[PDB]
Every structure is written in structure tokens, then in C-alpha cells.
Amino acid sequence: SRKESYSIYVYKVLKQVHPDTGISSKAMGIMNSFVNDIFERIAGEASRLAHYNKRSTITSREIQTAVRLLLPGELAKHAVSEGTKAVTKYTS
Amino acid sequence: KESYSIYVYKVLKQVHPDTGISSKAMGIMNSFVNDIFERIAGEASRLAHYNKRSTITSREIQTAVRLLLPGELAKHAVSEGTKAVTKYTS
Amino acid sequence: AKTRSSRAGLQFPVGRVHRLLRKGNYSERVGAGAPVYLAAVLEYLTAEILELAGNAARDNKKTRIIPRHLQLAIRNDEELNKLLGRVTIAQGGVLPNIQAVLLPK
Amino acid sequence: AKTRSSRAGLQFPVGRVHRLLRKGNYSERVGAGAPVYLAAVLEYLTAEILELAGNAARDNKKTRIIPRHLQLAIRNDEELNKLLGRVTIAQGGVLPNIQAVLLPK
Amino acid sequence: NIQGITKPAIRRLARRGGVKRISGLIYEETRGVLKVFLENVIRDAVTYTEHAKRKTVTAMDVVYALKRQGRTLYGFG
């Protein structure tokens, strides 16, 4: 009975931003909760966006708009930068 | 563009045969019907996902109704739903 | 031929509801009873609100229900009011209500 | 075998995110860039929160981040606080805050 | 343009809200509040408008923005 989670990716990110810092199991649980929450928010909003515009496909544009609706200000701008850069690099 | 206008009007004629409705009021009732549709369908969708079921059935609809509707409205709505399914099935 | 609504004893469109469920990105499949049930629930709620609002319209010596009547109907009903606690009814106004302390005497 | 995450320059799993989009009943089709974008955003947000929480952990002379640090990080940051305004962090407690009028006079 | 939301209009709104007596400082305060509210809705609304590759804010854009703020509006669908 295998369980998947975002734990290892959260940990990799943690090691990126704080090389000498660890994290409790409970705090990791809270981070997993967080990631799932924001996923369900963004994906949901993007679903609605696609539906409103009679589109059958969720693209990076739906994701971007959803990010702009859900996140406040600078958080939104920075997230948009990360997303756009990731997609542009990925396609290349 | 579709709407629930004709069905709302039919229902209105059932409960008040000599009563009409303004255009604005009909647009509010359309808003209402679409809203409750989304609440119930959304909750039923989540119910189906949580339980790893790929099919939304009348059971999800019922549970969703029990979650979303308060008290007496829930009981009566559940009664009407089950009653309608039973009659349709017959 | 006879309709999924005729057979269910409903006024609300079972076929339409079914189609909206299928294309609403809710689940990969949709059961036969689900749109019947849902249509029945929607019709029931509509009936309750139109009942009360019709009463208000008759009380205002009107033959046509207007948004004001819908507002009065919904807000003066406890459960309908909770159900629609976060909803704004355009041109509905508010319930007449003055806090007792504000009474001049 | 180079992965989509590697190509996108990310730590978060693009393939997994894609699968979750596909089976989450969000849309009939999913573009190639959507899971990349989403994974990138999720990764970024995770990074911001871990940054602030790590800072809070070091402020308490602590090397391990605990839920308290996450709470301090989120609540002392205006935009994260907005984003998570309706979220409860278990074992997070609250920000120290005493109303001035309550202090001795 | 915020001053276009005049004192007697605010008084009317307060009356509908059941307010009997009103401080002089209320009006400016109210304007600030109103401004914020609008900024929050319109922002989201316009976001929708731009996602649709349009240049005209529709009633539905507004409705979606309000809905996503948990300020659901009936009557403009």
C-alpha cells in the first residue's frame, strides 16, 4: 500500500533555501497540506476559466490567469515569473 | 443561450396559477438554479473523488444535498429526489 | 415517445441536467438516477421560493413577483436565509428592521 | 532518462502534476505547458514559505522547522497571511499580541 | 472621482442599513472602504476580461469576480 506525497520535493526546496535546516514530520505534513490546497485552488479556477470560455483544454494560460486571481500582488507576479520561465525553458 | 425560465414558469403556475413574474425576478431565479446546481454537482464530484469512484450517482447527489442544505429543506429535498427517482424507475 | 421529466413527474428538464452533469467536468461517468434526483431537488427548492414570493406578491397587491418579493420571501425564512446567506439579490433591498434603542421614545 | 522536471529546471514533479490534472476531472484535455507552469508555481510558493519559516527557526536558535515557525512565517507576512486567511496551522499557536489598553497604566 | 460619491448618497446607504445618526468623519472613511472594495472586484473582473482576450468588461466577468470573493450576485446572468 504505497502512499505518494510531496515530501521529497519540499525537502529538496528546503535544502535549496536553507542548506543547514531540517523540518519536523508534522511541519512536513503541513507543507503537504499546503501544496495540495493550492493545487486544488489553481486547478479548480483554471477549470472554471476553461469552461467559461467554451474551451476543452486547460493550458498554461488558464493556469496563469488562475494564479493571478488567487494570489495577492507581488506573490502573484513572482509566481507568474517562475511559471512562465519554467514553461519557456521546458519547450525549448 | 439557455436558461431555466420556462421550467421556473411552469412551477410558478403550479404553485400560483394566477401569478406572474418580472424579467429581473426571473433572472434572479435563473441565477439561483444555476448556483444550487453548481453547489450540489461540485460537492457530489468531490464525494466521488474522495471515494475513488468515477461515477456520480443519485447517492452522491443525496449526500451532497445533506451536506449543503439546512434541516427541513434537506429532508424534503431528499424526499423529493428519492421519490422522483423511484417514479422515473417504475 | 415520453420525456425523462414526464416519467419522473418533474417540470425541470432531466435531459438537460444530465447533459450539464456530463459536460460539467464533474466525473468521468454519470448515473441514470443522478439527473432525475438533482432536477427534483432544484424543482423543489424553486417551488418553495416561488410559493413564499408569490405570497409576498399577493400581499403587495401585485400579480407579478419582483426581486423585492424574492428578497422578502428568502430573508423571512430561516432555512432559505441560511442557504443563501452569502447571496446578493439585485433590487431586493433589505428587510425593514430598526434597532429598538433607536426608537425616539 | 531526462525528465520533464529536469527540462523545466524544477524540483517539483511535472509528470505527477500532469497525472493529477488528468485524473482530477478539471478539463477534457490538458496542455503540455500547464503542469510545468503549475509545478513551478507550487514549487515557488513552497520556497517562499520555507524561506520565511527557516528564518523564524533560526531566530529561535533552532535548526529544525516546526509548525510554530510556519505560523510565524505566514502571519508575519502580509501576502501569505492573505493567501492563507482561512487556513488553520495545527500546533501553530498565535502571534504574540497584547492590546495596548490592557497594559498597566 | 471618489468625491463623486456624495455625502447624501452615503447617508441614504446608511439609512438603508438602519443608521439613525452619523459622524462627520464617516463619509471619507466610507469612500476609502468603497474604493478598496471596487479595486478588489474590478481587478479580478478585468483579469477574466483579459483571459477571454476581450477589451470589454461583461456583466459575467463581474459576476465571476464577485463569486470568487464570496460575494455572489443574483440577477445579471
Next chain:
Amino acid sequence: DNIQGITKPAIRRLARRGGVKRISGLIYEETRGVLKVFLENVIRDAVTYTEHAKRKTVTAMDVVYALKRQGRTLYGFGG
């Protein structure tokens, strides 16, 4: 009568965390009422989920879903 298990000093502690310096005597009973209502609303939904899944065991996820649909999103128990 387990609502009385939520004692005066426990409520006092909760209020302290909430920044309360001084507490009227009638508060505690009031609080017991409020909490009771709160629990009734969450647990109800939780049990509903449990009943939908044809289980006899309330899971952490059932609670989490109930809290979420009540706009009380809870982090830390998805594991």
C-alpha cells in the same frame, strides 16, 4: 454531560491565548454553548462523509473535508 469537561481554567487558557485579560463569570457557559454548536456542525458533516464511504470509522480526512466545506481549512492531517 461531557461539555462540562471543558473546564473554566481551560477556557481561561484559550482566552489568554486570544489575548483576554479579564473574564466575566458568565463567559464559560456561553463558550460551552458556542463550542458545542461548532462541534455539532463539523462532526455532523464528518459523519456524513463517513456514512457516504460506508465506513464505521471517522477518519482524519473526513474531518478535514468537513472543515474545508465549512470554510475552516485545516493543515497537517492529510498524512
Next chain:
Amino acid sequence: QRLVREIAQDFKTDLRFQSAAIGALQEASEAYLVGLFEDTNLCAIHAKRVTIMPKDIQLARRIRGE
């Protein structure tokens, strides 16, 4: 209308508005303000006053999570 278009110009440029859009914004705005004034009134009455003050509005908005 003027206020709405002005605020909107600060987000996205050369925008156009349906009349129904502006109307929707006005119904929403006025409903919001009215409800806020109800809560504000409750705060003033709570403080044994009959007169609403900015303080009351600020309390109401703080408890609302605004």
C-alpha cells in the same frame, strides 16, 4: 461609472464596459456598503452610542476579516 472606469484604468488600459457590468458593480457595491453599515451600527450600539463613527466601521471590518 466615472469612479469604476477610473479604478479600472489602473489595472488594464483602453477598457470598455457593458452597461450591465457597471450596473452589477453598483448593485454589489451598494449591497456591501449597506450590510457594512448594519454591522457598523451594531458596533456603535454596542458602545452605547446611536452615532456611527469610523471606529465602528473599522471594528466591523476587522471582525469580518477585511
Next chain:
Amino acid sequence: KKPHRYRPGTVALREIRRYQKSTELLIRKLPFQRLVREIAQDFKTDLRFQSAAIGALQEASEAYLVGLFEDTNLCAIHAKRVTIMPKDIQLARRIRGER
């Protein structure tokens, strides 16, 4: 020498600082467990519970009550009082849209 005696408020303030500094649950585990099982028993009988379910319920309940007490405190202070009363809880919950 009369024994030592802090003035009313001092220990209260001390407690505020103490409990705002920490994160431990403030309601006793076992009685909370009993309350939850009692209430749940009134909806469905012979229910069982994961321990994490009850823990989730307690974290949620205490966060809720704490926030409520913040708002209540603001209501009391607004009325130029230092003591929270039922009118302050009722006002807070009314403005929250809980009642």
C-alpha cells in the same frame, strides 16, 4: 511582613504572554475525546475514530475559540471595557455571520 500578592491583572498579563508564546493544546485530551464521541454518538451509533481525527477536531476547535476570543476582546475594548462578556461574544459571532 504580609505575604507577597500580585495585583489583579499582573498574573493575567503573564498568562497571556505565556500562552501566546506556546502552541500546546489548552483543552484536556481525554475530556475533549469524550465530548466528541458523545456528540458523534448522537448522529451515528457505534462509531469509531482514528486518533488523528479527534486530534484534528481539537486543533480546529481550539484555533476557532482562540480567534473568537480575539474578536470578543476587541468588542469588549470597543465598549471601553477590559472584561469580555456574552454581549461581546454575541456581537463578534453576529458580525462573523455565525448568527
Next chain:
DNA sequence: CCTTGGCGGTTAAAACGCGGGGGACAGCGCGTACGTGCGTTTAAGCGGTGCTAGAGCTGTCTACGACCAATTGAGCGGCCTCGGCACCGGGATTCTGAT
């Protein structure tokens, strides 16, 4: 000698009460802000008149995504090790109140 069922002994957290001190309440007095009204004014509303930007719609071309075999290694489950600190023992700091 072996098995099982009471009343104490000790820990730990919590109402009663007794003094007690200060704080909401009510009252009195003072100040000035604004409702009510009056005189003066103009911009929103009605109703036209004209000009035009671009979304709905249609059509045409297509390529990225859905779907289906093959492939394989980091993800996941189960153990192994070791240092940060909760608590403990003990001394220096610091409010805190009565004088």
C-alpha cells in the same frame, strides 16, 4: 501458598471563600457639530445626432495532445545512527510592591 477484591496513599488539576482594590455605571456639567432650514447654483438626466472598435461568427489549416505499447530508476518501504534540546540542578537579573 496462590488468586482476586476492597479502602488508603499520593499526584495532579480544579471550585469556595475572604479580603480587596479598582472599574463600569450613573450623574453633573461643559462644549461644539450638525440637523433643519433657507438662499443660490449647476451637472446628472432626457433626448437626440453622429462616428466607429472590435467580438460574434465563419471559414481554413494544423499540430500538440489523447491513446497505446515498451523501458527503467528514483520513489517508497523498512531499518540504523547519533546530536538538539526539554527538562533538571543552580546562580545571576529584574520587576514589584510597600515604605
Next chain:
DNA sequence: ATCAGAATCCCGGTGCCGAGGCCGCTCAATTGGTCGTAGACAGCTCTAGCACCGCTTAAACGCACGTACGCGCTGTCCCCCGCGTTTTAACCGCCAAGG
């Protein structure tokens, strides 16, 4: 101002247990290839959005004014607070009853 006393912060210590590290499977992520339909791009249009203006007047703006509500100051009883005093729930613990 001034000092005694309790709560608080800080200096060894300590061992322990849970997080970090690691080793062994395997299925889900990755690779390659093939259909195909929803997506991307160009054009018609005419509809609703927008710019400009004559006529109207009641809503809006400026000012008189006086008092009643907001605010400052004071008397007061009573209503929670601090700490001693019990007060109560819970985990043993041992001796007595029975075979």
C-alpha cells in the same frame, strides 16, 4: 527615591528518541510511436460602445443657528482577582477474603 522578595533568564548536563541517512524492490514516471479533433490564424460584419450637444430642474453646495449628544470630571458599590483552603478525579498499593 529604596530595599526585600519571588518570578525570570541564563550556565552545565544529559541521554534519548525521532529525523537524517541508507539499503533493498517496482511501479509509476519516461520514451517512442501513431490518430485526430479541438486549437491556432485570417476575414465580414454590424452591434453595441463611445464622442458631442440642447433643454430641464432637483439634487448639490454655501451659510444661520441652537441644542442635544459627545466628552471631561466625580461618587459609588459591586464584581471579578490573588492566594489559602479544601475539593475531586486518577494510578497505584497492600492486606483481607476465599479456595
